[PDB]
């Protein structure tokens, strides 16, 4: 509820001293655009050389052990990406201490809508919530200075009939989807930009957040092209290549494409992996796989030219890339591939696109690395993030490679066990939603990862519609290895193809905690998102009847 | 002789439009087999050539060296105009 500059001028003066600092900000979670956000931010403090902690967090239940045992000299504090839905003040508590409060949380998300408790009754924040969704936002508004604090039975009554009229309004808020308005990375760099920071890779740092979701939606981000396009228009390295030069030598705009890996894998692996034409070619059928092959008849792409590695394919085809699939593809209805990307080059080392970049970094988290056992694999995974962190950095690519060679794999796994579903036509169409479930599949480890089904959930969401009438209904995936039974089940949203009339807003959320509230069945929200939860085997069936009624969409 | 060239204009008739059991050209689908498969060698039945005419089965049995030459030409224009490319493959 503050301007950028101004949040950024207090979280100044309550900073610096002896001892520095203290401030823990809290990289949160497993989401890309974390990274990309606190990076540059790392950045920026690191530019006034300001102290800092830095914390990986995985389990939201995680956070308790850690804001409620280590807190000492800390009078301000950063959070990212946590707190928009659940309010902390209630879950920390906070217990106010000494107005003028001695620390301030400042908390980052781009998750809505935002807790209730959070906006107003300024305690520990100092909220993010600036500018998107400001608004109003008026449900919120008189969701307080109506309650608070709240011939005289008739205006008893009609004091109550008011209160209650209140919350209806105020329940339909706060029960609700949860959709990312704008990448909280964009944000920063608007609070970057009025400080006056140009930074070249910290603008990188935006293309990385911004392209961290489009796997998933934009939503508004079809939009947001204004905003980043313009500010690849407020620089430039050179006026004209001087080739190359080996260095500046920076980002740039190209005919970049959904397709997958198209510079770091061979061609023809790139479309047969490739998530969009998964789908509208039908690529686990044999009958269609074929299909491909007659898209490659129609470029007068060899077979053999497709499937060798895409450094070293012939010049003539590179020229032509541009054009023959404006040739071809148009006619295949795959006329939605070609987005105008931003592609950062190093030179003499290559050049990397936006998205492949980002499929790089998700590569890493999950691989390339009863409660002691979840425990010890998060902290696996928490130890993994700073394998994945260092990627980001320029003077290390060594290892940004060990990230591709995995990208690769982790499809080669995904694809092989998608297609070992639809054979099997393991889908339910049931009658409110589609759902599914994994009772058996080969090399659950690659799973255990939330990310992991969020991508295989995102390829199989995008498979089983193109659209493909009708009815886009959220997907329900599960996988099991070890920790008994942990049954991992992440919630998902429906994909429209390209032409996106509404967010639709993601109702698990909602669905899963009417669950927790009712008989509670080996139900486990540890997991920071709201979408994604933990169910044992003996409870899950019921659970799964619980889910199916009563249908809250 | 270039009076063989008028037998491609016929020939050609005999490799796309040419149609058995019910539609569905079947030398047409071979094109198109490789086509996705770019295996090229393209395969016609002497049954069905023989079947159009008798004229060319005989061409079959006396001459088969230049006609063969004059023909894969040809079969090499239907793929052409079934598939705008192959100036680079083979």
Redesign the interface.
């Given at each position: 509820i503050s301007q950028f500059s101004e949040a950024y001028n207090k979280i100044l003066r309550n900073s610096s001293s002896a001892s520095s600092c203290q401030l823990v900000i809290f990289v949160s979670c497993l989401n890309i655009d974390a990274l990309c956000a606190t990076k540059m931010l790392s950045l920026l403090f690191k530019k006034q050389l300001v102290q800092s902690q830095i914390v990986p967090i995985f389990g939201y239940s995680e956070l308790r052990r850690h804001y409620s045992q280590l807190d000492d000299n800390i009078n301000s504090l950063l959070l990212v990406g946590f707190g928009g839905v659940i309010d902390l003040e209630a879950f920390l508590e906070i217990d106010p201490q000494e107005q003028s409060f001695r620390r301030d949380i400042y908390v980052l998300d781009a998750h809505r809508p935002w807790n209730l408790d959070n906006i107003f009754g300024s305690q520990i924040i100092q909220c993010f919530d600036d500018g998107t969704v400001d608004d109003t936002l008026g449900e919120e508004k008189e969701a307080y200075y109506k309650l608070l604090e709240l011939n005289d039975l008739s205006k008893r009554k009609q004091r109550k009939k008011q209160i209650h009229e209140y919350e209806g309004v105020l329940e339909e808020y706060y029960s609700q989807g949860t959709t990312v308005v704008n990448s909280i990375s964009a944000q920063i760099y608007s609070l970057l930009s009025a400080i006056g920071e140009t930074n070249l890779s910290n603008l990188w740092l935006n293309i990385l957040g911004t392209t961290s979701l489009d796997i998933a939606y934009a939503q508004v981000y079809n939009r947001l092209y204004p905003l980043l396009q313009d500010e690849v228009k407020r620089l430039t390295p050179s006026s004209r290549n001087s080739v190359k030069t080996p260095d500046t030598l920076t980002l740039n705009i190209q005919p970049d494409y959904y397709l997958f890996l198209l510079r770091h894998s061979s061609l023809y692996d790139s479309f047969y992996y490739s998530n969009y034409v998964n789908a509208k070619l039908s690529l686990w059928n044999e009958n269609g796989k074929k299909r491909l092959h007659k898209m490659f008849a129609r470029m007068g792409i060899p077979l053999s030219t497709a499937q060798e590695t895409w450094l070293y394919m012939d010049h003539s085809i590179k020229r032509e890339l541009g054009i023959i699939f404006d040739k071809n593809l148009d006619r295949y209805g795959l006329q939605d591939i070609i987005r105008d990307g931003f592609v950062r080059t190093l030179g003499y080392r290559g050049s990397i696109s936006a998205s492949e970049f980002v499929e790089a970094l998700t590569a890493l988290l999950e691989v390339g690395n009863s409660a002691q056992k979840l425990t010890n694999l998060r902290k696996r995974w928490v130890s993994n993030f700073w394998l994945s962190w260092d990627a980001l950095d320029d003077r290390k690519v060594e290892l940004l490679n060990r990230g591709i060679q995995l990208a690769q794999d982790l499809q080669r796994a995904i694809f092989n066990t998608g297609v070992a579903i639809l054979e099997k036509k393991l889908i339910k169409h049931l009658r409110i939603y589609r759902l599914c479930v994994l009772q058996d599949g080969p090399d659950l480890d690659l799973y255990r990862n939330p990310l992991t089904l969020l991508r295989l959930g995102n390829t199989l969401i995008e498979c089983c519609a193109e659209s493909e009438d009708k009815q886009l209904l959220p997907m329900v995936l599960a996988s099991i290895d070890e920790n008994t039974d942990t049954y991992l089940v992440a919630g998902l949203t429906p994909r429209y193809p390209r032409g996106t009339k509404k967010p639709i807003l993601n109702n698990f959320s909602m669905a899963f905690q009417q669950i927790t509230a009712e008989t509670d069945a080996k139900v486990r929200i540890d997991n920071f998102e709201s979408s994604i939860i933990e169910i044992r085997r003996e409870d899950l069936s019921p659970f799964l009847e619980k889910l199916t009624l009563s249908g809250l969409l | 002789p270039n009076v063989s060239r008028t037998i491609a204009r016929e020939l050609k008739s005999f490799l796309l439009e040419y149609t058995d059991e019910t539609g569905r050209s079947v030398y047409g689908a071979r094109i198109?087999t490789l086509?996705?498969?770019?295996s090229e060698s393209l395969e016609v039945n002497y049954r069905h050539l023989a079947e159009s005419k008798a004229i060319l089965a005989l061409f079959l049995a006396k001459c088969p060296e230049e006609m063969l030459k004059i023909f894969d030409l040809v079969a090499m224009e239907a793929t052409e105009l079934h598939?705008p490319?192959?100036?680079?493959?083979h």
């Amino acid at each position: 509820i503050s301007q950028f500059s101004e949040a950024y001028n207090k979280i100044l003066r309550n900073s610096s001293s002896a001892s520095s600092c203290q401030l823990v900000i809290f990289v949160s979670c497993l989401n890309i655009d974390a990274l990309c956000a606190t990076k540059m931010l790392s950045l920026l403090f690191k530019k006034q050389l300001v102290q800092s902690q830095i914390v990986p967090i995985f389990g939201y239940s995680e956070l308790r052990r850690h804001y409620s045992q280590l807190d000492d000299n800390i009078n301000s504090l950063l959070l990212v990406g946590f707190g928009g839905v659940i309010d902390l003040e209630a879950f920390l508590e906070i217990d106010p201490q000494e107005q003028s409060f001695r620390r301030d949380i400042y908390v980052l998300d781009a998750h809505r809508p935002w807790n209730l408790d959070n906006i107003f009754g300024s305690q520990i924040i100092q909220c993010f919530d600036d500018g998107t969704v400001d608004d109003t936002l008026g449900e919120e508004k008189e969701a307080y200075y109506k309650l608070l604090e709240l011939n005289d039975l008739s205006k008893r009554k009609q004091r109550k009939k008011q209160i209650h009229e209140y919350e209806g309004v105020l329940e339909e808020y706060y029960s609700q989807g949860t959709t990312v308005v704008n990448s909280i990375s964009a944000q920063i760099y608007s609070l970057l930009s009025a400080i006056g920071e140009t930074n070249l890779s910290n603008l990188w740092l935006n293309i990385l957040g911004t392209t961290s979701l489009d796997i998933a939606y934009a939503q508004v981000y079809n939009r947001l092209y204004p905003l980043l396009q313009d500010e690849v228009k407020r620089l430039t390295p050179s006026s004209r290549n001087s080739v190359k030069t080996p260095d500046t030598l920076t980002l740039n705009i190209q005919p970049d494409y959904y397709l997958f890996l198209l510079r770091h894998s061979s061609l023809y692996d790139s479309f047969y992996y490739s998530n969009y034409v998964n789908a509208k070619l039908s690529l686990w059928n044999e009958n269609g796989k074929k299909r491909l092959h007659k898209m490659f008849a129609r470029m007068g792409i060899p077979l053999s030219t497709a499937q060798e590695t895409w450094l070293y394919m012939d010049h003539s085809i590179k020229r032509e890339l541009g054009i023959i699939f404006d040739k071809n593809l148009d006619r295949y209805g795959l006329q939605d591939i070609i987005r105008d990307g931003f592609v950062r080059t190093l030179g003499y080392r290559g050049s990397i696109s936006a998205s492949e970049f980002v499929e790089a970094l998700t590569a890493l988290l999950e691989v390339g690395n009863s409660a002691q056992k979840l425990t010890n694999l998060r902290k696996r995974w928490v130890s993994n993030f700073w394998l994945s962190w260092d990627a980001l950095d320029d003077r290390k690519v060594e290892l940004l490679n060990r990230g591709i060679q995995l990208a690769q794999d982790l499809q080669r796994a995904i694809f092989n066990t998608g297609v070992a579903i639809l054979e099997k036509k393991l889908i339910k169409h049931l009658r409110i939603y589609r759902l599914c479930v994994l009772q058996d599949g080969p090399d659950l480890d690659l799973y255990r990862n939330p990310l992991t089904l969020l991508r295989l959930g995102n390829t199989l969401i995008e498979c089983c519609a193109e659209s493909e009438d009708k009815q886009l209904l959220p997907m329900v995936l599960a996988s099991i290895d070890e920790n008994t039974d942990t049954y991992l089940v992440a919630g998902l949203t429906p994909r429209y193809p390209r032409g996106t009339k509404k967010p639709i807003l993601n109702n698990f959320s909602m669905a899963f905690q009417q669950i927790t509230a009712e008989t509670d069945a080996k139900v486990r929200i540890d997991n920071f998102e709201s979408s994604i939860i933990e169910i044992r085997r003996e409870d899950l069936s019921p659970f799964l009847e619980k889910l199916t009624l009563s249908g809250l969409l | 002789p270039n009076v063989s060239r008028t037998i491609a204009r016929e020939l050609k008739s005999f490799l796309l439009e040419y149609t058995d059991e019910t539609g569905r050209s079947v030398y047409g689908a071979r094109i198109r087999t490789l086509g996705e498969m770019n295996s090229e060698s393209l395969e016609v039945n002497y049954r069905h050539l023989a079947e159009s005419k008798a004229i060319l089965a005989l061409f079959l049995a006396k001459c088969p060296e230049e006609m063969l030459k004059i023909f894969d030409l040809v079969a090499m224009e239907a793929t052409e105009l079934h598939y705008p490319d192959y100036a680079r493959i083979h």
